[PDB]
Symmetry: C4
Subunit: 480 residues, 4 copies
């Protein structure tokens, strides 16, 4: 018992040191106010009205001419700021290099006009795919904006947008350091008709740097031009910390990174020495599976932070020439992947803390309750999600062309979780379909929220009463 | 046991093939992005401001003169697009033929002015009914806009609107291919006063075609003119796929339609051979009743898809002359009916999957729980809906003239489901009636959400504890 | 048993006839679309912008000069409509007579300036009470707008507003039939400064009549001028049916009124013959108490419908002279009281239906469950409302000066019911107080929604398990 | 038993007198309509558009030039009102003295530009701290607006803002009694560039007095200028009652204050005489701990109301000279502290009422239920908050740079309480991260709302069934 308590004590203090080091590392991932660095950029570029007589945003673009009014107007008035040269956005954020506008095109004849309509309609342009993509030169043909450049040649990568996944290739134009040259270039693209019926996407990419808080911010504005016509705007404001060793707390964060990877080396050694004793008996446990998940996610985090996130070859390459476009699209991608991995790792490391709070009879009753009802809650989770996805496919077939919240199948699932909580927009459901809007909503509230929601609760009630009346009979019958 | 498992296995693989074929069919009913084809049309016609100095939408029309500003303004600037002839909306969507504006009128003297007020008020115009409807010529009397045309003669059908159900007859005017002729026609209707005090509805109907994604879109804009005065706008943007065999996946969808109707022939043969053995004993089951519901809904789906939805006689009739109005009002109606039928059929086919997940002792406990509490949940559902409709009739008598959410009795029911979830607009309830708004809301939250909502939960708790303690005593007493 | 079933059968068919007659009566109280008669009047007078260069509504008035812009602007453009004389609003609704603007004033010196500030501040005007009210003539003193008229002399009655209850007396001005005379009168009130620092309320009253649907609509617009400065607007659009016998369905409604008061005579005779047998034993029942409540509310409904609602002496008095103000302020008051009484009566008549659904063993189990848990749910309702009003008084002391939803104590109670459901505006709570906003919200969610909400549920679970295990032991032990 | 009931009776009537006196005291803390005194000031200064061609508020300031448009525009049009001298805001609220604008600055060179960027970027200005704060004179150097004044010399105190805690020192400028002198001063600050890149905060402070209701109102407008660039506006409208003895009800409130502090003297004597008998046995009770909490909070309330809130030395000092700035920043601070203390004291005094409702067998069952489940609910509250803060740290790492509701860690906690209720903005979560937005939301709804929320409920169900079946066996076995 003293050796069991000694081993529990040393693994507890090991885990507590590990949890302290990890919570220090994610204290330095989040600087104190980066939200007020992304929302000023967002409200400068997305929320300002496009022209002085227009009320459209970037968020509410609806046409191609609104996109030209944005590119000639709010984009140029946001990027270029007159000095008290080169532009400091909000007189703080240095615009790095030049921005870049890039277009993706589909071919004429990339779809098939039906045989009874080949007299009336001459041309058709398919939805964006890589097979449908246009490689031909067009327009005046005398620049990089008019000639196709491959994905390998403009150092790009695939972007996952709202209606398609867009290749990193296309028809790009790097802009200029000053507003007047850039306005001349945008007017020369609009005059020669650069965006037409074959256009399926337009990317606007630039990067700023804040010397005060030492953060880059990689901006990507995407406008998707569907085959149906119109405009779907999308944006991405992504901060990067690419220059690490500036302040003392950054050196302490580097020290905690080293101490963290020593902890992860220790846990990988420990779980390998535990799994070698017994093979499939190791996975007949929840905590060994959770330790496997933690060390896999942590090795993936160390791998991203070595081979991807800390490869600032493009930054030193940009610091040679300030008149080019800085390719920060890969650093931002792997910073997003690293933040997702690290957040999920911190989550499961806090879930691991439940090995060490069976310190009491009450906590042991709670733990025994949920471990004994896990199987029956999983069975009813299967049954619940069968009825839940039946309703989601019903709602997708009924409202999928009319309602924003039901437009894709996963959005139907997430909308139903919101309906179960109470986040409804029933006005648009009830005006999309006036008979099955009502019937869908009322039968989903009755059969899910009144009845099947209470069945998880019934499983937990019965298991808690069983565990209490069993561990009380065990406590009494030993005392008799 | 081996033959029972063999029959269960063959009906399981039959059902799984059927579910795969049906989920393929409703993968091809929903194209990937039709929502972005209806919302661009909606934001072009509903959400654009009516005039350049006006802020009213079509959604926020409040008067007859706002309707004339819409018909002279946002409607003409949305329909007619200058080519790089005939108009391509968003340079993608071909306007098919001409649009059509149609009016429904009631008679002077169609109601009775009370005897003490026949001196002051000369004329009264009743709420729209078919008996009150005006058949007389009026105005200049020299067109189709000024002379009544029956429902049989303009090929129309009854429309179910917000305050009435409107006959397909009336005073119609087909518009023109170009903007200037159509503006002349609308100005000639406004000059001669076409809409006056007898007007009860105005329909605007047109159809576009997108060659890129191969979808028609049947637009119907309704403005209802109540007897109280004012305007109630209503719209309907409905996509159709009327040209089937264009792509290869469409041929695969046709093959899956044939394989589906062979499955439905198989299930109708099976359920007839099962019902012939025993009459009313067949309906003493849930799964035989569900199989009856599935084959009835599926036969109705096949009947709509043969005798109604796949009758594109008006499309080939329209392709002869591009200067007429294409009657797509029936195809859109039966496409809505087919989508409702098919969505409900897919829902119950997924519910049928619960015959085949009694594969475990836990799943059998869950199934036995809900099948044994079904009767007592139905009894308390009767009692709950009696108190629920008592509150709904209370709230209709109190707020039915003041609040949008309580304006009709079914909307009172749906508003109370939203209050139970937590979708409240209590500001308008509390300013409609400051005493019974409060009392209604607080007693509805106390008696429904705190007390009667927990009674379903009590039934499910007690039935689950009973089923577990019974199937555990059955498992133990057989082992003793 | 046959005589018991015979008496139950005759009282059941008596109650069913009574419920049919009552549901017919409240089918004719609610005409089919009165909501679209109040919202057109509301959107004409409340929601139109006050001036063509102004964006304020009547709903968003914030100053006295905005009130003059409304009275010179949106009010006159809403009331007076040029004919194709006298004004038909939306060319349907006849403006009856002239409108009337009325002011309530407080005295100079109606409060006490503190002794250290009687040098700087000369005058102070107390919050509106009847003791503080000004009776003096003022201004040019040569009209009814400048001379006090008592409540008995302008036939008015007390109005219960947002911050005070306002007497029906004051300084009134009846306006005119045409727009130009009324604009001259409003400009003459603004020139001579009619609203100043003593003003505490301004009422605007008018009535319209719709000949098409046979409804009056009594409009009262109130602007309250607090002692703090500013404007609190308030409105009331109230439809009346003052001319009864016009259509055939109205005669059938009168016949159902007579049959209803015969039913209420029958039930009063029955409950008096039942209460005379046994005194306080009669009130030891729920259904006898509910019958007492129904016949009291029904006698109050008949009394309002005879002595108040059907006294259309002011209507025939108005029909003599169309150039005066029609006093419909009492008819609207008693129509609101009659609608409240009748809605509550219909509610309890539907609750009475539970005497007659103990037709089954399951329904008897549900009824026995709730009748046996009524006492313990009432005890925990006492305990719950003690903690609930403790939180409401906490939230009133903390947010009562900052948040709209916590401004009065009853609004704190209703806001907490909304928080329990999930209708939160946490942004304004969290910016009103950044420490106790959080602590109030999180401890109210934890202690009410997680814990004390589940205690009602515990009472109902235990009582249902007790009633089922008791009525099953009664069913088994009789069979053994 | 008679002496036990006698002691319970005398402590009950003592507590009831105490509760009446305390509820009278917090009836006079809240005047009837102070909310309509703060919202008129708020809608005058925050919600009016900044210029006649601008639509920005004070609430929606986004730049430094919008702040100059506010200070030259809406602030001057709100403060200065032309008389029928000195300004009465809404012709009721006397502007006391002059306002004051004050700036906080950071030094050039207060951060470290990284070594590879010291060529491009010359200067950097750190986030506001006291060590980074600028003390140097700047600009024209010939006023108080251009020369640093310490916190001890301008009588200020530290302000806790949104992104920092701001010292009470800085660069202040007292404004003027009239609009033209103040406009000259603000134009002279804008001309000489008073706000530049070193500015981190700008305070605008003024005080009004309403003679009608006898309330001061201390306004503090804060604009925070982050290092990222932009503007974060913040406000504080705080009413004070600094002149006590004006009306008779104020004398009754003073009498109730004296009677309250006599009650608190009585309870401190009683709890000291009870704690002296037994030391740590005293704290083995809930009601003795609650009495300790009440008398500690009440002594803190009396201490604030004597040594801080009732020290109106600055008011009589201001009444000598009406041309200076009245320092009401300390009185408002301690009035906020006193309102927090008094509201929490009233809350726990109402919670103390549960000593005296064990008057019944049912109330004793409810009390015994919650006192016996307190320990197991505390254990599961520990386990629940471990999983809850694991999710909050996940959501802070994922959405903390993108979403308003997740910007700080405590706001992540409060957002998750809102998600559990049903106050979601899922659109911004789902567009911040399209993979972990969904996964976070759905796994938080499944694991918290479906499963772990029902575990508190299971504890309460089992404890209530145990207490009922135990106190029924105690009632029966004594009767056998
Ligand atoms: C017992 C089995 C149940 C009985 C059978 C069910 C009832 C069958 C007939 C119901 C009519 O079917 C109903 O038709 C109306 C139009 O008339 C359709 O409505 C559709 O068009 C109307 C207007 O035309 C729109 O207002 C509505 O938003 C749209 O959904 C509705 O979607 C469909 O659901
Ligand atoms: C014990 C049985 C309960 C005691 C009897 C109940 C109290 C009877 C008297 C209550 C007064 O009845 C109450 O009158 C006010 C106006 O004064 C009505 O209010 C009505 O007009 C006022 C203004 O005039 C509006 O503010 C309010 O929105 C409207 O509902 C309210 O709807 C009605 O509910
Ligand atoms: C909870 C629901 C309650 C709804 C029912 C309320 C009670 C309504 C019935 C009360 C008696 O209803 C009463 O009907 C008589 C009919 O002779 C009406 O009388 C009116 O018309 C009759 C005949 O047309 C005239 O002789 C009489 O002078 C006139 O006042 C009276 O205006 C109405 O007051
Ligand atoms: C007196 O009444 C007349 C109307 O007869 C009005 O025009 C005039 O303004 C009033 N006198 C003053 C001083 O306002
Ligand atoms: Ca909710």
């Amino acid at each position: 018992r003293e050796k069991y308590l000694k081993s529990v004590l040393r693994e507890l203090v090991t885990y507590l040191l590990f949890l302290i080091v990890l919570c220090i590392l994610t204290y330095g991932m989040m600087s104190s106010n980066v939200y007020y660095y992304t929302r000023m950029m967002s409200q400068l570029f997305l929320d300002t009205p496009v022209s002085k007589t227009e009320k459209t945003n970037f968020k509410t673009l609806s046409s191609m001419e609104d996109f030209w009014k944005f590119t000639e107007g709010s984009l140029l008035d946001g990027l270029y700021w007159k000095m008290q040269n080169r532009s400091f956005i909000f007189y703080e954020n240095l615009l790095l290099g030049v921005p870049r506008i890039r277009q993706l095109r589909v071919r004429n004849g990339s779809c098939s006009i039906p045989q009874d309509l080949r007299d009336e309609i001459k041309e058709c342009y398919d939805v964006y795919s890589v097979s449908s993509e246009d490689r031909a030169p067009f327009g005046p043909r005398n620049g990089t904006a008019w000639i196709y450049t491959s994905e390998k040649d403009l150092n790009g990568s695939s972007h996952w947008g709202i209606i398609a996944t867009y290749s990193g290739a296309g028809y790009y134009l790097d802009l200029s350091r000053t507003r007047e040259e850039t306005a001349a270039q945008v007017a020369s693209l609009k005059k020669n008709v650069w965006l037409d019926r074959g256009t399926r996407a337009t990317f606007i990419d630039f990067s700023v740097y804040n010397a005060n808080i030492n953060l880059f911010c990689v901006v990507r504005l995407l406008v998707e031009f569907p085959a149906t016509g119109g405009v779907i705007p999308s944006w991405q404001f992504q901060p990067l910390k690419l220059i690490r060793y500036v302040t003392t707390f950054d050196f302490f964060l580097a020290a905690c990174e080293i101490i963290f990877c020593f902890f992860i080396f220790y846990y990988v050694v420990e779980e390998i020495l535990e799994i070698r004793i017994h093979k499939l008996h190791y996975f007949r446990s929840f905590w060994n599976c959770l330790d496997v998940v933690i060390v896999v996610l942590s090795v993936v985090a160390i791998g991203i932070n070595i081979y991807r996130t800390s490869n600032v070859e493009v930054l030193l390459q940009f610091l040679e020439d300030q008149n080019t476009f800085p390719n920060f699209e890969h650093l931002a991608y792997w910073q997003i992947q690293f933040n997702n991995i690290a957040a999920v790792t911190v989550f499961f490391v806090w879930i691991k803390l439940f090995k060490f709070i069976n310190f009491n009879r009450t906590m042991s009753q709670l733990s025994t309750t949920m471990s004994r009802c896990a199987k029956d809650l999983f069975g009813f989770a299967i049954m619940f999600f069968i009825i839940f996805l039946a309703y989601a496919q019903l709602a997708y077939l009924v409202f999928g062309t009319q309602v924003d919240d039901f437009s894709t199948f996963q959005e139907c699932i997430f909308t139903q979780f919101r309906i179960i909580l109470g986040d409804i927009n029933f006005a648009e459901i009830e005006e999309a379909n006036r008979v099955l809007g009502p019937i869908y909503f009322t039968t989903f509230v009755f059969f899910m929220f009144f009845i099947l929601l209470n069945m998880f609760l019934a499983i937990i009630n019965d298991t808690y009463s069983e565990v209490k009346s069993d561990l009380a009979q065990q406590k009494a019958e030993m005392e008799l």
